[PDB]
Design a protein around this nucleic acid. Structure first.
Length: 802
RNA sequence: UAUAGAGCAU
């Protein structure tokens, strides 16, 4: 269960000069002394812990600390570059700030030399405790100077998004090990916050009011409840922060709570009356509801006009479609621009003048690390038809002009369901849309032979299922049902649910805007999905020139767990069903809320292996498992439970079936940025690195098998190079063969003629989980939730998720 | 239609 070492360094590809947002750290050889803080009371905010620790350092600078500048991680860990005048014995002391008891005890020394030795690769594993200590040193001053959020820092600059939310600009910071060097990783980040403002103004923005002008309808009140629930408020009629648990149904003039009088008897008092008697405040908006704060037992109700949303709360609830576009537009930066913003950050951070960094004798190089990348050459894409045409990706893109599908599918009986009113979508429109899909159809090797046999408009999600039940029975061999949607509507969720999991009909929805104004590229892309949904093969990797792994039966898997913002989490595993590889079967499960480990993985892998054996007649000798987005924190847990589950599936099939397992974690959510050193290598308006750029040196793991591969062309903003970490490899891949293999798999994604940012199986796993969300639509029996996700027997064999 | 892109613990 220990990750394998790096087997070698790749040599394939054209060398390219690069810079990464990794800055070398010169670490002294000293020992760090580690002290544990016990602060009473506990579970104060990390900030107050810092202020408590802050004042303590000056008082006992005379007695305890002196001229040393200790660093504090909040919570309970304090570090010094110099041992404190404290015997191993504990010291209990008192800190008062506008009363806290604090006990200091030595815990350990951190040997920076041991880190030096582990970076040489000599030690088997880098000491995690030394890396933690360095991280606390580097972010001590930023933590005091800004509002920390995860490993990022933010501050006050308006960048509105509407609905009460703002986008804040900050930066990410983390210390990371590489070969022979510790690195500081710095990046610009931007996240959504709630604007600090009176709650009265919050309801306006959440409910679109011009101004506060009576009562809330059930509609308005339940919407405002979702927006504010969980957010923290501060009191103004007295500075006192509460958490909003709920928004009362009754208005402040009629909401009551039990109040104990001078005598022992308790009475019901309205919130409005109480604020008249106890605070001499006549509520200005008595018709608006209250906020229920604190424990349910106390009946703590706060009128809206007395609370502010507390400044600094990071928005985690999902953003509306418009807010998302405004944040994306406002945060996208071209690769060259991002490099400059990082350079500015390093200048203003001025780490080499941070007194805490200098206290510990640390220096940070101000230039980005130079790394040589290798641009891998892309695969050739083999198409079908009489030409047998071979596309060659250029800058991560190709097209399908003068080429047709490898295995095109005759569409002899299909038809159109229009859910947009015919004033919007007219009969002339449908045929004006159908006539051009025909041309792009037959051109592309998938010929829609004739007209749409049935063409009936309608509205209503209840209309969805009956219409479909009508069509499957009456039209023999009805292959495809095209559906037309008028903007966002729950009909979409019902169309997939019915077709995917009920009747088992190939479904293809098209926005109403795209039928009226037709693009050949949009039509062509529309055929990519249609053909696959009907069982076709759009194209295959050029058989020759595939990596040697294809000499023996191999199955490729992609695993993914998507979580809700308690709603259940969704696990998805897809598996290749041929040697191309192009066709994938899907398995999906619902599991506990927010659990990263795929609980039912063993049964899912077993199902996929059986399907592979039925489709090919071969038992895979090798299992290549692409696992999406598990942080390093959970490598050991995820690997332990999921690597054993994979083996369990093979042994459960056949006592002595033991194919080689390669376990690879795939990570887009990191802060590694790569920039071309030479301007001639920039691709596009965004100026990113070329598709195929691979880095496995200089900024990678000191001993383990990991590499960055930017398989895609950067279109908007700065590219995210995908990171791949081999946690297990029975098959002893060379660095070259695994990188090339991973790159070629990024060219087998059927939705577009472009190399995508992750391999098709990992991308399909994301789609299969994503589609299961719409399957779960309602209008919570866990046996019934597993039922709403299980797909029809007709569809499951085919890639319905495309 | 789709890739990419900011983020996604009283």
């Amino acid at each position: 269960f220990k990750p394998p070492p790096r087997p070698d360094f790749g040599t394939s590809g054209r060398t390219i000069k690069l810079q990464a947002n990794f800055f070398e750290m010169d670490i002294p050889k000293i020992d760090i002394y580690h002290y544990e803080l016990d602060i009473k009371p506990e579970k104060c905010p990390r900030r107050v812990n810092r202020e408590i620790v802050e004042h303590m350092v000056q008082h006992f600078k005379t007695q305890i600390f002196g001229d040393r500048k200790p660093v504090f991680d909040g919570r309970k860990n304090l570090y010094t570059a110099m041992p404190l005048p404290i015997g191993r014995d504990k010291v209990e002391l008192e800190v008062t700030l506008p009363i806290f008891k604090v006990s200091i005890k030595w815990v350990s020394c951190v040997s920076l030399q041991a880190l030096h030795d582990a970076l040489s690769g000599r030690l088997p594993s880098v000491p995690f405790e030394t890396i933690q200590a360095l991280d606390v040193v580097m972010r001590h001053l930023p933590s005091m100077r800004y509002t920390p959020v995860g490993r990022s820092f933010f501050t006050a600059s308006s960048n509105p998004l509407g609905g009460g939310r703002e986008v804040w600009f900050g930066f990410h910071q983390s210390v990371r090990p590489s070969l022979w060097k510790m690195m500081l990783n710095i990046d610009v980040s931007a996240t959504a916050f709630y604007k600090a403002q009176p709650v009265i103004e919050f309801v306006c923005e959440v409910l679109d009011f011009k101004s506060i002008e009576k009562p809330l309808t059930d509609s308005q009140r339940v919407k405002f409840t979702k927006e504010i629930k969980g957010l923290k408020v501060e009191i103004t009629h007295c500075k006192r922060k509460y958490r909003v648990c709920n928004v009362t149904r009754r208005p402040a003039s009629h909401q009551t709570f039990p109040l104990q009088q001078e005598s022992g008897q308790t009475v019901e008092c309205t919130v409005a009356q109480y604020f008249k008697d106890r605070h001499k405040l006549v509520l200005r908006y008595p018709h608006l509801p209250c906020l229920q704060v604190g424990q349910e037992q106390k009946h703590t109700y706060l009128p809206l006009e007395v609370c502010n949303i507390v400044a600094g709360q990071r928005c985690i609830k999902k953003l509306t479609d418009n807010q998302t576009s405004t944040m994306i537009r406002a945060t996208a930066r071209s690769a060259p621009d991002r490099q400059e913003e990082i350079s500015k950050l390093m200048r203003s951070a001025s780490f080499n003048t941070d007194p805490y960094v200098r206290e510990f004798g640390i220096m940070v190089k101000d230039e980005m690390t130079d790394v040589t990348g290798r641009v891998l050459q892309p695969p050739s894409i083999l198409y079908g038809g009489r030409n047998k045409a071979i596309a060659t990706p250029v800058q991560g893109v190709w097209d399908m002009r003068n080429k047709q599908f490898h295995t095109g599918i005759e569409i002899k009986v299909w038809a159109i369901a229009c859910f947009a009113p015919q004033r919007q979508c007219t009969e002339v429109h449908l045929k004006s849309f159908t006539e051009q899909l025909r041309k792009i159809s037959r051109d592309a090797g998938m010929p829609i032979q004739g007209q749409p046999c049935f063409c009936k408009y309608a509205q209503g999600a209840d209309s969805v299922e009956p219409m479909f039940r009508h069509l499957k029975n009456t039209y023999a061999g009805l292959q495809l049902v095209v559906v037309i949607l008028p903007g966002k509507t729950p009909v979409y969720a019902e169309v997939k649910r019915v077709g995917d999991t009920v009747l088992g009909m190939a479904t293809q929805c098209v926005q109403m805007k795209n039928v009226q104004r037709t693009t050949p590229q949009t039509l062509s892309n529309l055929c990519l999905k249609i053909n696959v949904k009907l069982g076709g093969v759009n194209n295959i990797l050029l058989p020759q020139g595939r990596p040697p792994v294809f000499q023996q039966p191999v199955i490729f898997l992609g695993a993914n767990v998507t979580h809700p913002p308690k709603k259940p989490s969704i696990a998805a595993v897809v598996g290749s069903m041929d040697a191309h590889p192009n066709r994938y079967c899907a398995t999906v499960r619902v599991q506990q809320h927010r659990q990263e480990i795929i609980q039912d993985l063993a049964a899912m892998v077993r199902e996929l292996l059986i399907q592979f054996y039925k489709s090919t007649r071969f038992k895979p000798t090798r299992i290549i498992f692409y696992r999406n987005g598990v942080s390093e924190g959970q490598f050991q847990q995820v690997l332990h439970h999921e690597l054993l589950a994979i083996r369990e599936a093979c042994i459960k099939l056949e006592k002595d079936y033991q194919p080689g397992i390669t376990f690879i974690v795939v990570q887009k959510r990191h802060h590694t940025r790569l920039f071309c050193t030479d301007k001639n290598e920039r691709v596009g308006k965004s100026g990113n690195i070329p598709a195929g750029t691979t880095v496995d040196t200089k900024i990678t793991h000191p001993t383990e098998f990991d590499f960055y591969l930017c398989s895609h062309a950067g279109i908007q903003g700065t590219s995210r190079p995908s990171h791949y970490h081999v946690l297990w490899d029975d098959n002893r891949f060379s660095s070259d063969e695994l990188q090339i293999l991973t790159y070629q798999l990024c060219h087998t994604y059927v939705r577009c003629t472009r190399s995508v940012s992750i391999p098709a199986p990992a991308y399909y796993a994301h789609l299969v989980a994503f589609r299961a969300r719409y399957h779960l639509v309602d209008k919570r029996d866990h046996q019934a939730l597993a039922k709403a996700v299980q797909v029809h027997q007709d569809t499951l064999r085919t890639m319905y998720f495309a």
